[PDB]
Amino acid sequence: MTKWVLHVDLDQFLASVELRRRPDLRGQPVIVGGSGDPSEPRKVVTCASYEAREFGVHAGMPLRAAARRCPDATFLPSDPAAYDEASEQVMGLLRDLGHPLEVWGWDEAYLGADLPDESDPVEVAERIRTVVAAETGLSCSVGISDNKQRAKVATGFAKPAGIYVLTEANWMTVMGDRPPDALWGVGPKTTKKLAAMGITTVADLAVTDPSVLTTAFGPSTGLWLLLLAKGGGDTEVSSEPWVPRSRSHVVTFPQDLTERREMDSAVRDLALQTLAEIVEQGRIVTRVAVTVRTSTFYTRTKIRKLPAPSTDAGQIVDTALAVLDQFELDRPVRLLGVRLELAMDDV
DNA sequence: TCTGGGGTCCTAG
DNA sequence: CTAGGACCC
Ligand SMILES: Nc1ccn([C@@H]2O[C@H](COP(=O)(O)CP(=O)(O)OP(=O)(O)O)[C@@H](O)[C@H]2O)c(=O)n1
Ligand SMILES: [Mn+2]
Secondary structure (H helix, E strand, O other), X not given: OEEEEEEEEEOOHHHHHHHHHOHHHOOOOEEEEOOOOOOOOOOEEEEEOHHHHOOOOOOOOEHHHHHHHOXXXXXXXXXXXXXXXXXXXXXXXXHOOOOOEEEOOOOOEEEEEEEOOOOOHHXXXXXXXXXXXXXXXXXXXXXXEOOHHHHHHHXXXXXXXXXXXXXXXXXHHHHXXXXXXXXXXXXXXXXXXXXXXXXXOXXXXXXXXXXXXXXXXOOOHHHHHHHHHOOOOOOOOOOOOOOOOEEEEEXXXXXXXXXXXXXXXXXXXXXXXXXXXXXXXXXXXXXXXXXXXXXXXXXXXXXXXXXXXXXXXXXXXXXXXXXXXXXXXXXXXXXXXXXXXXXOOOO
């Protein structure tokens, strides 16, 4: 018996969804962003089709930037209702396969297949591609390995519309020259710190003395990085309801903000908006965090724990309005954010 | 071609 | 008990 982990990632997801209802736009540059107006400032690309990516457009890029880089791209507004519906369909469809299925956000899922040892993980991956293509119209890629992090890395190589197998057999030969941030979990900061320790590749980190890392990163993070560099990872595909820990709404305003009357009303509204949504989900708030960001793009957040789990609107808005009070100035605030942390204990 | 929004987790003081 | 650093989709 061979335990496989398959990572299923829908290609160009938001674009592909748009493509189902604009099938004339296939093989053309399509950019999905804040409101379909590229001229609109303070807005960014949410998803760039593969054709738009050939001109350098990528998620995070301001839409003005991307229209300069790709003037013939069709810009479409974000339509979250249509993406929730596309997502639940394809997943709902992948539950119908009878393997354990772990869903990660919207596009992506992990599938646990224990295969007799007669069978072919490549074989299962194509079916998933064929059924997904045939029933939803969307295209997916599948990375295959024996643990979640390495399967995800395999998806990187499987894209677009493909399948890639990444195991102990080929991990180090495929990945050993890559910089540490190619690993899932590792970003530019860690890379930079590892660079300052003489570790500039996956292969270097894999043979790095445990002590160096556990002194530098903590006795659990240090060993985890070593695990990751050797291609290790989580191996259990948990098929259970994901329970959110928090919900949050931030907003960067069309105009910079200076007078506090606006600032208070925004954090009040964010607080209430957030709280109704979690009241709908049968959740209780534990702590209220407020975020401010200046014209600098400075950015700092503050949290306060409620005296007791609560759902009380007045007590929560006041806490949010009280935490906003601590932030120093009444500058040009670019962005205001409220996150509610939720109880994790019972229902 | 001035910089989005929703998340999780872990470790310092 | 919190600050925020770091990564992720
Ligand atoms: N910064 C980000 C990164 C991602 N997302 C959202 O997450 C989905 C997939 O992430 P993803 O990272 O797998 C990309 P996908 O669009 O499927 O392209 P691919 O086929 O080559 O992977 C996207 O369609 C975005 O709306 C976002 O809002 N902000
Ligand atoms: Mn994805």
